RNA sequence: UAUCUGGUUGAUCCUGCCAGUAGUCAUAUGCUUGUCUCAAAGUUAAGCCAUGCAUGUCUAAGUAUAAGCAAUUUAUACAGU
């Protein structure tokens, strides 16, 4: 089921005549919890506009992930596949699958990517600068997925000819 | 298996130093001061030290205080070898 969960805003000050106006740069993470996530950021005048702008554009940039059973475990049960590192600016996000019962251990940016992907038991690490709007979230989205980042290892054999 | 924030700007992103968040100490100081168990308690002048105490024990190593000889002390059923 599609869950919209809001991360944060910054109040973006623009200098204009007589005084400043505001604009809001909103971050909303979409996900299914079965095995899809969604990245969306856009701006607007008000907070009420910016949230809706981040909601809709996240449903374009939908990423499948290999988690869960189809029949047999084609995705890893309640965890990520392998480990993946990924840079995006002066920012790195690193990942590791955990055993079951651990729960979702992560930074508050990457946490709502993982739980809305359905990924329960993981440890998650960032290093360096953490710039939450842009860099860590972009880095985590290119690290977590199937189209980006992870491969399972079944699809690795399916793609060549046996 | 490792999550950073604030301060150089009109604003932004880097570089970079500083300040703060944590855990710890034979502890010390301000303040308040109600208990217990366990553990610890001169880091400075290996500086100068009063007084009392920290090193003794055996008579089971011997003559063997009879036979013979001064004085004093202790023990007993009687000898007290």
| Residue found by looking up tokens 């856009």 in the block | A42
Distance between CA atoms of residues A84 and A71, nearest Å: 25
Burial class (CB in 10 A: 0-12, 13-18, 19+), A136: buried
How distant is C1' of B49 from CA of A136, in Å?
Answer: 72
How distant is C1' of B1 from CA of A45, in Å?
Answer: 42
How distant is C1' of B38 from CA of A66, in Å?
Answer: 55
Judging by DSSP bridges, how do beta strands A24-31 and A3-10 pair with one another?
Answer: antiparallel
How distant is C1' of B14 from CA of A128, in Å?
Answer: 13
Percent helix, strand, coil in chain A, to 5, is 15, 35, 50
Question: Of A51, A29, A53, A56, whose CA–CA distance to A144 is shortest?
Answer: A29
Q: Cβ within 7 Å of strand B: which of A 55-84? A: 83
How many CB atoms lie under 10 A from the CB of residue A83? 11
Is A131 within 7 A of strand B by CB distance? yes
Distance between CA atoms of residues A16 and A71, nearest Å: 59
How far are the Cα atoms of A4, A10, A90, A93, A136 from residue A128, in angstroms, in the given order? 28, 21, 7, 9, 10
Q: What is the resolution of this structure in A?
A: 8.9
Distance between CA atoms of residues A8 and A47, nearest Å: 11
Three-state secondary structure call for residue A153:
coil
Task: Tell which residues of chain A come right before a gap with C–N over 2.5 A.
Answer: none
């Amino acid at each position: 089921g599609l869950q919209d969960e809001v991360m944060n805003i910054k109040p973006v000050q623009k200098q204009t005549r007589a005084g400043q106006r505001t604009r809001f740069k909103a971050v909303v993470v979409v996900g299914d919890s079965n095995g899809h996530v969604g990245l969306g950021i856009k701006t607007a005048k008000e907070v009420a506009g910016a949230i809706r702008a981040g909601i809709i554009i996240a449903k374009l940039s939908v990423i499948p992930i290999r988690r869960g059973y189809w029949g047999t475990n084609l995705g890893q049960p309640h965890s990520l596949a392998t480990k993946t590192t990924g840079k995006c600016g002066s920012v790195t996000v690193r990942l590791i699958p955990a055993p079951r019962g651990s729960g979702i251990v992560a930074s508050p940016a990457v946490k709502k990517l993982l739980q809305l992907a359905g990924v329960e038991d993981v440890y998650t690490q960032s290093n360096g600068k953490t710039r939450t709007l842009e860099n860590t979230l972009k880095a985590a989205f290119v690290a977590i997925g199937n189209t980006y980042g992870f491969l399972t290892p079944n699809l690795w054999a399916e793609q060549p000819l046996p």
